[PDB]
Amino acid sequence: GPSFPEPKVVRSQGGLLSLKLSATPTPLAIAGQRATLLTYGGSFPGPTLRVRPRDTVRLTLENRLPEPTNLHWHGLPISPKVDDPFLEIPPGESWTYEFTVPKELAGTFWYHPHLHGRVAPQLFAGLLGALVVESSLDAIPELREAEEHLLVLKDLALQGGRPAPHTPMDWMNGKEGDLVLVNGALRPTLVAQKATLRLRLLNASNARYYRLALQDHPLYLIAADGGFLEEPLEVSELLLAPGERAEVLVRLRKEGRFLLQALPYDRGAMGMMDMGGMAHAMPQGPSRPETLLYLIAPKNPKPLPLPKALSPFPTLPAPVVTRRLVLTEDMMAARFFINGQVFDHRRVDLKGQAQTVEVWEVENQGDMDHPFHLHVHPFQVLSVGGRPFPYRAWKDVVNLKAGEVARLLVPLREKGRTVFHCHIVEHEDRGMMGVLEVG
Amino acid sequence: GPSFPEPKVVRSQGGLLSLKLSATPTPLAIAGQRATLLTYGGSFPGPTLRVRPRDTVRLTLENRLPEPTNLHWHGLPISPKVDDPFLEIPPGESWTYEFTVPKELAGTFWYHPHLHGRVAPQLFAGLLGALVVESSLDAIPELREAEEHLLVLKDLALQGGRPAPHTPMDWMNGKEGDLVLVNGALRPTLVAQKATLRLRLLNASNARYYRLALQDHPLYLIAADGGFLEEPLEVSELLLAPGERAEVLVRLRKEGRFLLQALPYDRGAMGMMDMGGMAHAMPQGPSRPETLLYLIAPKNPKPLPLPKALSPFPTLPAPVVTRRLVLTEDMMAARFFINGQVFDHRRVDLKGQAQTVEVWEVENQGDMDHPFHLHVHPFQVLSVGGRPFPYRAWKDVVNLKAGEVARLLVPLREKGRTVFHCHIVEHEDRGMMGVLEVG
Ligand SMILES: [Cu+2]
Ligand SMILES: [Cu+2]
Ligand SMILES: [Cu+2]
Ligand SMILES: [Cu+2]
Ligand SMILES: [Cu+2]
Ligand SMILES: [Cu+2]
Ligand SMILES: [O-]
Ligand SMILES: [O-]
Predict the structure, then answer these.
(1) Which domain holds residue B270?
(2) Count of domains forming chain B
(3) How far is it, in rounded angstroms, from Cα B281 to Cα A383?
C-alpha cells in the first residue's frame, strides 16, 4: 500500500453521496496488534466522505452496537432537525440522515456519536470519520499543485484486545491513550513527492491535545475548523484541541527527515497523591512529547509560492445580544457545569433569533483546559484571554485555558433546538452541556 | 385666593408622607360651571405630594368609585410589586401603597389610574395628581431664588354636568376636550413677582398635545420626565405629549402681558368624511391654537443668571441586548398593536436581567403620534427619527411621530413584571401595551 496510510475516500457522484454505514464491532489490525474496535464502515478511522457545496448527502447509519448511538455532523451548519443531538438509534435499527451541503462552505469536518452519557466510550473505541467539503478555491494553482493528505489525530489504549475501559479518573480528566496514532497508524512515514504539502488536520481524540510542530519548519495556516482564513498565516507551532480542525501548507525547505511532533502541553489533567496525610489532587503536568509521523522531503525541494489570498471573511451584521457562559468543575465528583448547571435535555438554556448575530463570552473558571463547542452555528473567535485572534475564519470549537475568556461572534443560522458543550467528551457526558433554541 | 391656582401641597413630615386619599365622585366648581368629577382628595387636580429622596410614602387609596381602580406611580423607579399595574381595588375597598423614594431622584412625577380597559374614562374624569421629588440641587441660588409653580396641563369636556362620555371616535384618536385647563382653571393669570420663574410642567391629558410657546420668550429646559438635564438647554418651543413632564426656567425680559400658548400641532387624529362615495377616514389636521395662561411680568425685570450646571448624567454600562418594538394601528377597529399583538396580562413579551442595560428601538409604523411609556425603568433617549437627542436626562415617555424610530438606553432596575404602553390611554385600553419581566 501507499507508504502513508489514509482512510478510504467516498465521493459524491453526480451531486449525490448515498451511502449505508454500519456501526459495528470490528476485528482489525491496529499498530501491529489485533484488536476489536467499534467502527464505521469496517475501518478505523471510518471512511472519509468527500463532497462539494450543494451536494445531497444521504447517509443511512445502521446500528450494530449493543447500545444506542447516533451521529453528530460536527461543524456542518445544517438543521438540528437533521444533525439531531437528541435522537437515539436503538441497537439493530437504522436511521437515514439527509441534507444538502451549504453553498458557502469549505474545509475539514467530521462525524462521530453524540448520545449523551455514551459519547466518550463510543468515540474512544473508534467511532469517527472525516468529511471534506471541496471548494473552487482548491483549483487555484498554489493549492492544486500541492500534495494533499488528511491526518486524523487520535490516540488509543488497548486492554485484552479491546479499547481500555474508562476509569473514574478518566471521567474526570478525559481519557488519553498510550498509542498516539495518525490515521490509525503508529508513527507512519510520509515520503513527500512534492515540495509543498497541503495537510488537513483533525483532532478526533477524546481529550488529548496536539501541540503540533514540524522540525525545522513553520506551518502556514490556511483553514480553521469551518473554513478558510483570509490569507495564509505563518505559525511556529499549532495547538489542536479535541474536536478542532486546521489546514496547513508545509513548504519543505531541504532534503531530509523531519519529525512532526506533539510537543509537551499541560492541559491541566490531574492525578492523586498521598504524601503523609495528603490523599489529594495533584497536577499531571505537561504531556510527554510524541512523534506523530516521519516526513521525508523530496530531492531539491522547490516549494510553490503561497497563495496571496484565500477567502474573504463575511462582513457580519451588528450583534443584538451578549451572552455569558461560565464553565466550572467539581473534579473529585467528575461533574462539570455551565453557569452552575449540568445538562438537562428538557431544559432550554438560551433562546435566540435566527439570522441575528450574538456575542458569546465563554469564561473558563476551572483549572483544566476546556474546548468549547457549539453545534449548528459556526462562530468567529474575536479574542481569547484578552488577546485578539490573529485571523478571521469560521470555527466551531474554541479552547480556553484556566481563567480565560473567549469572545465569539455567533451568527444564528438554522432554527431549532441544539446544544453547546465541552469537547472533552467525558465532560459533556458528565454534564458540561446546555441547550440553545433558535427561533 | 392667589391669582394663580395650584393644587394644594401635602409634604412629608419627618421623612414620612402618610396620607389617606379617596377616589370619589365630587361636585365642584370648574371653569365657572358646576360639575361632578372623579377626584382624588376631593379636588381637581388631586393634591400635589411633595417628598425628598429616602422619604417613606404610605398612601392608602380608598376606592369610592362604582368600578375597580388602582394607582400607577408614573415615572417612579420603584418596585412593580408596589407600582402594580395588575392590581385591582374593588369598589368600597382600600389598598396601601408603601415605598421609599429612591436616593438618586429628582423632578416632577404623577399618579393616576392604571386598570386595563378603564384608564381612559377614569383619567378623563379627573383622577390624577402630581408628585414632586425635591432635590439638594433646588438649593442652588439660581433655582432657590426663582419663583416656582406647577402647571398641570389637562383638558376636559362636560355634558350634563359630568365628563363627556367616550365616543367610538374617541377610542380611536384618544379623547380631547374643549376646556383647555391649567391646574383645573380656565386661562388663569400668573402675576409674576420675580423675574425668573421655575415652572414644573405636567401633561396629564388623555391625548391632547401641548406645543408650548411663551410670547416673546424662549424657555430654558432644566428637567425632563424623570430628572434634571446636565445643563440648561434653550428652546424656542417645547412639545409635551401625554404623560410627559418638563421643568423650565423663564427669564422675563420686560414688563407686560405674555401669553403662554399651545400652538397648532397635528398629532394625526382622524375624522370621517362622505363626499359622494367616500365614507372614509380624513386627517383632522393641526389642533387650533389655545391660550393656556396669561403671564404678567413684574416691573423692571432683572432675571437671575442661569445655573451653569445641573446634574451630571450617569455613565451607563455597555448594553447587552437590543430590542425592537413596532407600533401599528387598525384605526377603523380602534385596535392598536405592539409587534402585531394586543396586550394580554398572562403573556410575558420581553424578559430581561436586572442591572443590565438594553437598547430599545421603538418604531412607529402607524400614522398617528404615539407617546411610548415604560413603567419602572427610566430611560435615556439617544435619538428619535434618526436625530440625536440634544441633552442627557431620564425620561419615561417618548413621543414618536409617524414613521419615526426612537432609540433608548434602558437600564433595568427593579425585578418583577411590569408593562410598556402607549400613553394615549385610549390606545392602551384598546390593546397597545405589553409585558416586561425583569429577573
Ligand atoms: Cu464533535
Ligand atoms: Cu471540559
Ligand atoms: Cu456536540
Ligand atoms: Cu402615566
Ligand atoms: Cu397610541
Ligand atoms: Cu402605564
Ligand atoms: O461533539
Ligand atoms: O400610564
Answers:
(1) 135-311
(2) 3
(3) 57
